[PDB]
C-alpha cells in the first residue's frame, strides 16, 4: 500500500506492472471544487481538506461534451470519444510515478486537445505509465472544462468571465507545484506538453503571467494559439453567448440574469445548442474557445507574441505531414474514408467553401491558383494540404519563428510516419493526432502489434521528449542519431521524424506559408 499525503489530504494509488517493472498510478485526484450549480461558468474554486484517504484508483468522470457520432463502431473516430461517464463533476487529474519512488524527477504535464469542445485525459493513448517506466519521469494529466461550460464569455463578468477551462488547467499546474514533491517530483522541472487545442493551451500558458511560475518549458504538437481556430474575437464571443441564451430561452436584459438562467438549464440543453451559436461552421470550428478576458489573457495574443511578452524558455514545436486529411470526410463532397476520394476540380472548389465559408470569391480562387501548380489524386491531395497548411502547419511555424526571435532555443519537428495500425484509409496519410501514441510510448509494448521499426522510432521520440523536459535539449545522445538543431528565424532548420532516416531540412512549406501568413490575411 503506497499512500501519499497531499496538502489537501491522503490519496490512495495503485501499482501497475510495466515492462518487467512497476509504476505507481494515482487516477482521479480532485484538484478543484466541482463546478456545479452556482459555480457553473465560474473560475475553478480551490478544494478543501478531506480527513480520510481518497482512493485514486480509477479514472474520474470526463467533462460534459458532444460526441463524434459520424462513424459509429469505427475505431478511428471512437478512440477519441470519452471513455468515462460525462459529468460537470470532472475536475480531476492523474499522476504516474516510477517505482521505486524517484528522488527529484522531472514532471511532464499533458494537456489534451479537441478544439476546446471535446477531450479527456483518460484516453488509452494518453496513458503515462510507459513514460514513467522508461524515462523515470513523472506524468501528470488533467481534465478541464470544454465547450460553453468551459469557455462561455461575458467579458469582465465574473459569473462568466471566459477562459474557465484554461483556469482549470492552471489550477492543476498549481496543484503540481504544491504537491508533486510529496510524489518524488521536482516542481522546478515541469514541462507542459499537449496536442491540438492542448498545444494551443500550452502556447497561451506561455503568454499568461499567472502561469509563468508554474512550469519550466513547453512542447507544442500540432497546435498554437495563432491557428485560425484557436482564439475567438470578443465580438464573436458576445454574439455566441447571446445566441445560446436565445436558443435556450435565456435572453434577458441584465447580462447577469442571462448567466443565472443558463445555470438552471440541464447540461445536455447547453450541449445540444452549442453547434448553432454560429451561422455557418467548418469541421474545425471552435464555437467556445479562449478569449481575451483581461485576466488569463491581458491583451490580444498576437500582440504579446509579436512584442516579446511571454515566458522566456525553450520550446519544442512540430506538426504532422497530413494534418488536414482527417477533416475532409466531415463535410467535403466526394470524400469518404471508405474509398480513395478521387475528387474533381469542381469538387475541390466546393471543398473550399466548406472550409472557408466567409471568404470572398477572389480569396478562394487565390487558394485554388496557389495549390494547383502540379495524376488523378491531384485535387484530393491539394485540399488536404490546404486545410493542413492553413489550420496547423503555417501557424505553428509562424509561432516558432516569432518566439525564437526573442533569443530562446526552439526546436521544430516534422512527423511523417503513418502508424502501421492506422484504421483510417491510406490516402489520409500521416494524420492529425497520430503522433501521440508514439510520444506516449505505446509501440514500446510489443504485444500490441506495432512494427519493430515503430518501437525504435517511439523509443527515440520518447528519449528526445524526456531529454527536452529534463535538459531543455531534445537530443538522443547514445545511438548515433541525427543531432536536432535549433530553429532560428533565418535558417529555420527542422528535424523530420520517421523510420528510415532522420534529416535536417530548412523552411518547411516555405511557399505555402508565405501565402497563408502574408497574403491570405489581406483577402
Ligand atoms: C451573430 O448572431 C446572429 C444570430 O444567430 C442566429 O442565427 C443562427 C446562427 C441560429 O443559430 C439562430 O438561432 C441564431 O439566433 C447571426 O445572425 C444571423 O446571421 C445570418 C448570416 O449573417 C443570417 O442568415 C440570419 O438571418 C441572422 N439572424 C438574425 C436574427 O439576424 C449573426 O450572423 C452573428 N454574427 C456573425 C458575425 O456571425
Ligand atoms: C467515395 O465515396 C463518396 C461517399 O459516398 C457515400 O455514399 C454512398 C454512395 C456510399 O457508397 C459511400 O461511398 C458513402 O457513404 C462518394 O460520394 C457520394 O457519391 C454519390 C454518387 O455515387 C453521391 O450521390 C453522394 O452525394 C456523394 N456524397 C458525398 C458526400 O460526396 C464518392 O463518389 C466516392 N468516390 C469514388 C467511388 O471514387
Ligand atoms: C471536429 N469534428 C468533430 C467535426 C471532426 C473531428 C474528426 C477527428 C478525427 C481524429 C482527428 C485527430 C483528433 C486528435 N484529437 C482528438 C486529440 C484532437
Ligand atoms: C478504498 O479502497 C480500499 C481498498 O482496500 C477500501 O478498503 C476502502 O474502503 C476504499 N475507500 C472507500 C471505498 O471510500
Ligand atoms: C530538485 O532539484 C532542484 C534543481 O532543479 C533543487 O533546487 C532541489 O533542491 C531538488 N530537490 C530535492 C533534491 O529534493
Ligand atoms: C443585474 O443583476 C445584478 C444581480 O442582482 C444586480 O447587482 C445588478 O444591479 C443588475 N443590473 C441592473 C439592474 O442594471
Ligand atoms: C539505442 O539502441 C539500443 C540497441 O542498440 C536499444 O536497445 C535502445 O533502446 C536504443 N535507445 C534509444 C534511446 O533509442
Ligand atoms: Cl510533404
Ligand atoms: Cl515487424
Ligand atoms: Cl537517426
Proper CATH architecture: 3-Layer(aba) Sandwich
First CA to last CA: what distance?
63 Å
CATH fold group: Rossmann fold
Tally of DSSP β-strands: 14
CATH superfamily: Alpha/Beta hydrolase fold, catalytic domain
What is the structural class?
A: alpha/beta
Order of strands, main sheet, comes to 3-4-6-8-7-9-10-11-12-13-14
Categorize the overall geometry.
Answer: globular
Give the number of domains.
1
Number of helices: 15
Radius of gyration, Cα only, in angstroms?
22 Å
Share of helical residues? 25-40%
Order of helices and strands: EEEEEHEEHEHHEHEHHHHEHHHEHHEEH
Strand content: 15-25%
**CATH class label:** Alpha Beta
Describe the fold and architecture.
30% of the residues lie in helices and 15% in strands. It contains 15 helices and 14 strands. Strands 3-4-6-8-7-9-10-11-12-13-14 form an eleven-stranded mixed sheet, with helices on both faces. The chain has a three-stranded mixed sheet with strand order 1-2-5, with no helix packed on it. The longest helix has 27 residues, at 378-404. The protein is globular, with a radius of gyration of 22 Å. Homotetramer; disulfide-linked. Dimer of dimers. The modification Phosphoserine is found at residue 196. It comes from Homo sapiens. Tacrine binds at residues 80, 432.
